[PDB]
């Protein structure tokens, strides 16, 4: 009989693990490609330094983590443990941003 964990154990282990480190959780090449593609519309034939891309990635990840914390609070408020898009929409609506 193969060993199997109950649903929820590994999730809590990962929650504890990722709240202790201080690294970037998104691969770098796809993020760089996305940044260049987005900037392509405003001006043609642009160049970037490395630190510019690094700063953009840091700011983006901080923003996403904070938004997810607010989403979790909203989802718990309604007697649930699963997060749904309505929670993201309510959090963004209250926070002020469109």
């Amino acid at each position: 009989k193969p060993h199997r964990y109950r649903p929820g154990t590994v999730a809590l282990r990962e929650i504890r693990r990722y709240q202790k480190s201080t690294e970037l959780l998104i691969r770098k090449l796809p993020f760089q490609r996305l940044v260049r593609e987005i900037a392509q519309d405003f001006k043609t034939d642009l160049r970037f330094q490395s630190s510019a891309v690094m700063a953009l990635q840091e700011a983006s990840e901080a923003y996403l983590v904070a938004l997810f914390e607010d989403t979790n609070l909203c989802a718990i408020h309604a007697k649930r443990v699963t997060i749904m898009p309505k929670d993201i929409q309510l959090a963004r609506r209250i926070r002020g941003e469109r």
Binding site: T9, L12, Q19, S21, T22, E58, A59, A62, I76, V81
Partner: protein, 109 residues
């Protein structure tokens, strides 16, 4: 016979520069004139705040069995104190992380 020069920080008994702060205030488009007591006040306040943050961060670093301060320790010091957390409420520290925290309902029974 000019007397041997004595810097202004020494007379004020500080560790931060007073002449540099005077120059920055003058060439910064803040006012037409700058008095003779403003740089001393500003330097004292800046030194005090720096010392406070540094002491808390050093305590946090020693708690981790290290001897050099890294951004993680600065984040731990700033986020665990009420006044500093209120002052730096809209600031992001690179490679800082977050504070360990789990909601109570999610815990297993």
């Amino acid at each position: 016979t000019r007397a041997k020069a004595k810097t202004r920080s020494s007379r004020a008994g500080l560790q931060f520069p007073v002449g540099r702060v005077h120059r920055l205030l003058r060439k910064g488009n803040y006012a037409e004139r700058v008095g003779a007591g403003a740089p001393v006040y500003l330097a004292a306040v800046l030194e005090y705040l720096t010392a406070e943050i540094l002491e808390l961060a050093g305590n946090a670093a020693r708690d981790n069995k290290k001897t050099r301060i890294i951004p993680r320790h600065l984040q731990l010091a700033v986020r665990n104190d009420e006044e500093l957390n209120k002052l730096l409420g809209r600031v992001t520290i690179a490679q800082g992380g977050v504070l360990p925290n789990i909601q109570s309902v999610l815990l297993p029974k």
